[PDB]
Design a protein around this ligand. Structure first.
Ligand SMILES: Nc1ncnc2c1ncn2[C@@H]1O[C@H](COP(=O)(O)OP(=O)(O)OP(=O)(O)O)[C@@H](O)[C@H]1O
Ligand SMILES: Nc1ncnc2c1ncn2[C@@H]1O[C@H](COP(=O)(O)OP(=O)(O)OP(=O)(O)O)[C@@H](O)[C@H]1O
Ligand SMILES: Nc1ncnc2c1ncn2[C@@H]1O[C@H](COP(=O)(O)OP(=O)(O)OP(=O)(O)O)[C@@H](O)[C@H]1O
Ligand SMILES: Nc1ncnc2c1ncn2[C@@H]1O[C@H](COP(=O)(O)OP(=O)(O)OP(=O)(O)O)[C@@H](O)[C@H]1O
Lengths: 49, 237, 500, 85, 171
């Protein structure tokens, strides 16, 4: 023998959707963080008045 | 905080700033104040070594010290008058058990203010191409920018290689015709004398088989000093 | 060559059709000054900001990011090509240690990966189908010869320029350019002579030259520098004066080492008579053969004598006295245990790199040892002989002049190997024949005073001597070690038996 | 005051044999032993472990590793006399 | 604890019985050895010396060569002996001796023993055979000087010197 082979190889990235399209769902989850609180804001002060 | 007052010259206790009163500023201790100009008037990286853990090498320690730590410890102004760039790149070649990694340990961690990044042999090498090599520039990438955006003056960065002969050998004779260890070394060389001409590092290697090591790396400026350490004489002993 | 096209006024080449050069390549031995050059180019010469790539910096694990990082380099310079066809700001690229990224495509040994063939993307990008003009690219390599030549042919890269070692006086410019500032603020004495250095630096190049300088400033400060404090004094008055000589001696290796004649020369040369003069004169008449004549670019000499005559030492003397640019000693010391192939290979490297110079001299010491030779029965290695005997009759290219010596204590073996027929000439070393000649020699040495000289001298002249030096030294020495009276009697009695 | 971690190499000789450009080309994959002797005697004190090693063919092992402090003590156990037996 | 340098124990192997004095021969000989180490220690312009000990067979040669070193009290002694080299092809054999000399060339001075040379270099009379390589390496090393300032002696033994005149190592 007298054999030394030490080797390397390269990676295959699984198609993780591979587009920005993920953002739109992320935009919906923005808005549900965003547009919800003022309901309570005006709710508690509607209840004050 | 007033430090010294001089008259127009006697040094006085209370005086009167007038139009033609020149004033100098100096950043305090443990200060992060970057003052520039020369309306100023200090950093010395070595505060204490009395003696550290060593005997017999009072010649060799003297040589290494004067060569690669004197440019550091000097008036900066005169050295830029001198126009010389600091030597970097210590090498140590000898037989085993002669106290080399001890020596390397003490200077980096006991002599001067930094934490050195140390590779224990290779930690570098990896199954994937390019990221092992990239770890090299992951080493240098905390000190390079630092010089870029502080210029000449900087806190010293250090790299200690150890048993470097394993990772580096003469090209063309490496594990067959092309070689596995060839591209790591072509990066290392590319950075140390690299096109950026960073001045703020010393590379400390150590070996027991220095002939293997490539002259290409050993010529001055990449590693300038190849220093033998050997079996001590009795008085050192 | 490559910047005329930049500098000229545009109309002139507009009448021509030449597509302006893509790139260059420059190479040579290390520490020789090439990366300096490649900084200043692009620092000074162009109005642009360069992008540097370090050699492997391209490589990444995911299969397409390697190439997809190369096209990143050239997208700017191609979009401006598209936008502005005729001219552009000359986006330039700097590779470093390019040999890894580009080597011959048909070698996967040790790689076992296809990503060596990124190169196809590279040169298919550079000229490609899409010509890219108004870009410059420069390569840098220690190893010129491993590159796929598909990108060395002209128009992808025109120039193979090899930066060699500095010339002695050019070395002076390399030196003076550094010392300009050091002198300008008058931290340099007028006593040091840069020429005195530069002649005393045979092969120092570039960084190797600058190393002593950097060291010199260190050694010069350190005196005025000086425990716990390790104070740096305030004293600013200093200069390195004739300490560059001292460190030139001790600290660096040349990087091409000949410096040591010491192992060859313990005692120099005792000038012990007429023969030594005849020899050395024959020698400085022989060295001139090369230098004067262009029809004998190769010349070949033997040194014939008995053993223990120091022939191989004065060979080195005459070499340094020839004062050629490149000299070397092929020793069996440096080559030990080498099987005949490697024992040839070392020699191979010697003559091939020696030919590089416009001249050199080389000595071959103790060929009887180099090519292993023992009677009990003839036995030796032939391959070295064959190679060597060819090398003698290999004429270097285009009058790059050579001188060779070989040494033996025995010619009677050689006339059967037909080596000296191939050698041009041979010169004899007679060894010391008589008491007067000898006594003169050792009184040049000393270590017998006049009483001892005479005490010897009575009975020497009546006798006939056949001796050589290398035995005599050990004799006088070991005899010397004895007690004072005994010294000379023992010397004598040893000579009775040795030369008989 | 930390506690020991002992590590146990059953066969040393196969892993590490002399790295001196011997036994063919550079030993067998000698990068390993370089890493190791940098690790145990490295720039860190690492006062808290002992590694045990065992061979039936000791001479191969590199003296670089065997010196005092990386491994000081190489002992031989030999076929016992009647009492041990 | 043994060491990289000399041992107290390498000797008791080779001299088991010590050296008993049977006469003036023993005196003259080892006194010459003492003379030689003082030559090397004291002198300059003989960085090396070279001696061999001829004897007939079964006349202790190696013992003397050891006791000389043991009396010289030079700091670095590694004997190079065949017993530690067995079966070796000539290549690895010469590597071993050179390894010895290169370690020795580190120290400021040293004493090296070759013993049973005629067995170190393969030798047989019949259709006479030997290793050429080990020969050549050996005797250039005998002719070799270490880096300056350093000093050594090379002691050798054999039971026959006639063939060595024939093989032109004796000079
Ligand atoms: N002045 C000294 N000279 C030599 N050795 C020393 C000295 N002072 C301490 N030592 C001891 O030497 C030991 C080994 O030296 P060091 O730690 O440098 O590793 P080393 O054995 O030199 O490494 P290598 O075997 O790769 O050379 C240290 O662990 C220390 O205990
Ligand atoms: N020709 C030169 N002129 C001025 N300084 C030089 C010269 N050559 C070398 N130097 C010194 O060395 C440095 C340049 O290093 P150099 O160019 O030799 O690396 P290199 O030749 O690229 O090495 P390698 O070819 O092995 O990568 C300069 O900064 C200077 O300190
Ligand atoms: N004129 C001279 N010619 C030759 N050698 C001289 C002369 N003067 C002095 N020597 C001395 O000769 C010594 C070198 O002898 P050396 O061992 O080289 O002889 P040698 O011919 O190489 O021996 P061998 O033939 O065994 O190789 C040097 O120390 C040198 O000083
Ligand atoms: N004063 C002495 N001189 C010589 N030999 C002695 C003396 N005293 C004892 N001896 C014995 O001589 C023996 C020498 O053996 P040695 O190592 O010389 O074998 P050898 O003679 O080299 O073998 P060979 O005869 O094959 O060369 C030692 O075992 C030692 O006990």
């Amino acid at each position: 023998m007298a054999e030394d082979a030490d080797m390397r190889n390269e990676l295959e990235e699984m198609q993780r959707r591979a587009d920005q399209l993920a953002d739109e769902s992320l935009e919906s989850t923005r808005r549900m963080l965003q547009l919800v609180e003022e309901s309570k804001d005006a709710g508690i002060r509607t209840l004050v008045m | 905080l007033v430090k010294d007052i001089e008259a127009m010259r006697q040094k006085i206790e209370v005086g009167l700033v007038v139009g033609n009163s020149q004033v100098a500023f100096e950043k305090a201790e443990n200060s992060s104040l970057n003052l520039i100009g020369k309306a100023k008037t200090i950093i010395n990286p070595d505060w204490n070594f009395e003696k550290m853990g060593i005997g017999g090498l009072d010649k060799e320690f003297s040589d290494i010290f004067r060569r690669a730590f004197a440019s550091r410890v000097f008036p900066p102004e005169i050295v830029e008058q001198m126009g010389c760039k600091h030597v970097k790149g210590i090498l140590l070649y000898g037989p085993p058990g002669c106290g080399k990694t001890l020596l390397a340990r003490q200077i980096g961690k006991m002599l001067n203010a930094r934490e050195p990044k140390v590779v224990n042999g290779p930690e570098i090498l990896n199954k994937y191409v390019g990221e092992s090599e990239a770890n090299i520039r992951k080493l240098f990438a905390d000190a390079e920018e630092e010089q870029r955006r502080l210029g000449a003056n900087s806190g010293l960065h250090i790299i200690i290689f150890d048993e470097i002969d394993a990772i580096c050998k003469q090209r063309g004779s490496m594990a067959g015709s092309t070689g596995v260890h060839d591209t790591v070394v072509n990066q290392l060389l590319s950075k140390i004398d690299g096109v950026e001409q960073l001045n703020n590092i010393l590379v400390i290697g150590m070996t027991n088989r220095p002939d293997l090591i490539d002259e290409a790396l050993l010529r001055p400026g990449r590693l300038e000093v190849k220093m033998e350490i050997g079996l001590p004489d009795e008085k050192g002993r | 060559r490559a910047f005329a096209s930049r500098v000229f006024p545009p109309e002139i080449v507009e009448q021509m059709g030449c597509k302006h050069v893509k790139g260059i390549l420059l190479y040579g031995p290390p520490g020789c000054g090439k990366t300096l050059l490649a900084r200043q180019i692009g620092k000074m010469l162009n109005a642009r900001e360069p992008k540097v790539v370090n050699g492997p910096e391209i490589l990444n694990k995911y299969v397409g990011e390697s190439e997809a990082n190369i096209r990143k380099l050239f997208a700017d310079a191609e979009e401006e090509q598209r936008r502005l066809g005729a001219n552009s700001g000359l986006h330039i690229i700097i590779f470093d240690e390019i040999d890894a990224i580009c080597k011959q495509r048909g070698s996967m040994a040790g790689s076992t990966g296809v990503h060596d063939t990124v190169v196809n993307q590279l040169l298919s990008k550079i000229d490609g189908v899409e010509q890219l003009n108004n870009i410059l690219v420069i390569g840098m390599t220690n190893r010129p010869d491993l590159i796929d030549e598909a990108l060395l042919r002209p128009g992808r890269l025109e120039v193979k320029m090899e930066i060699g070692l500095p010339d002695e006086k050019g070395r002076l410019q390399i030196l003076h350019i550094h010392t300009a500032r050091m002198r300008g603020h008058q931290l340099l004495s007028a006593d040091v002579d840069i020429k005195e250095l530069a002649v005393e630096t045979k092969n120092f190049s570039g960084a190797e030259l600058e190393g002593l300088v950097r060291a010199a400033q260190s050694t010069a400060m350190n005196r005025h520098i000086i425990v716990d404090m390790e104070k740096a004094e305030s004293l600013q008055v200093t200069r390195g004066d004739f300490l560059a000589s001292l460190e030139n001696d001790i600290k660096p290796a040349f990087g091409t080492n000949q410096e040591d004649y010491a192992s060859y020369i313990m005692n120099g040369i005792i000038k012990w008579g007429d023969p030594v003069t005849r020899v050395l004169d024959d020698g400085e008449l022989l060295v001139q053969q090369t230098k004067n004549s262009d029809r004998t670019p190769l010349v070949s000499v033997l040194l014939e004598g008995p053993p223990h005559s120091g022939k191989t030492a004065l060979a080195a003397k005459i070499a340094e006295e020839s004062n050629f640019p490149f000299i070397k000693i092929c020793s069996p010391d440096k080559m030990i245990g080498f099987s005949e192939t490697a024992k040839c290979q070392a020699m191979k490297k010697i003559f091939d790199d020696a030919y590089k110079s416009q001249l050199s001299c080389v000595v071959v010491d103790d060929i009887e040892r180099l090519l292993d030779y023992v009677p009990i029965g003839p036995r030796f290695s032939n391959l070295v002989l064959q190679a060597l005997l060819v090398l003698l009759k290999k004429a270097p290219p285009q009058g790059r002049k050579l001188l060779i010596i070989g040494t033996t204590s025995r010619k009677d073996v050689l006339q059967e190997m037909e080596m000296l027929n191939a050698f041009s000439t041979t010169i004899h070393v007679p060894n010391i024949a008589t008491g007067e000649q000898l006594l003169e020699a050792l009184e040049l040495l000393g270590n017998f005073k006049d009483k001892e000289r005479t005490t010897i001298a009575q009975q020497v002249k009546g006798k006939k001597v056949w001796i050589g030096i290398k035995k005599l030294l050990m004799l006088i020495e070991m005899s010397l070690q004895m007690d004072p009276e005994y010294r000379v009697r023992k010397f004598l009695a040893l000579l009775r038996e040795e030369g008989a």
